């Protein structure tokens, strides 16, 4: 599972 927030 990847979660990226920028």
UniProtKB/Swiss-Prot annotation:
Site (Cleavage): 1-2, 4-5
Coiled coil: none
Top-rank taxon, per record: Eukaryota
Protein name: P3(40)
Encoding gene (name): APP
Portion of the full-length sequence here: 687 to 692 of 770
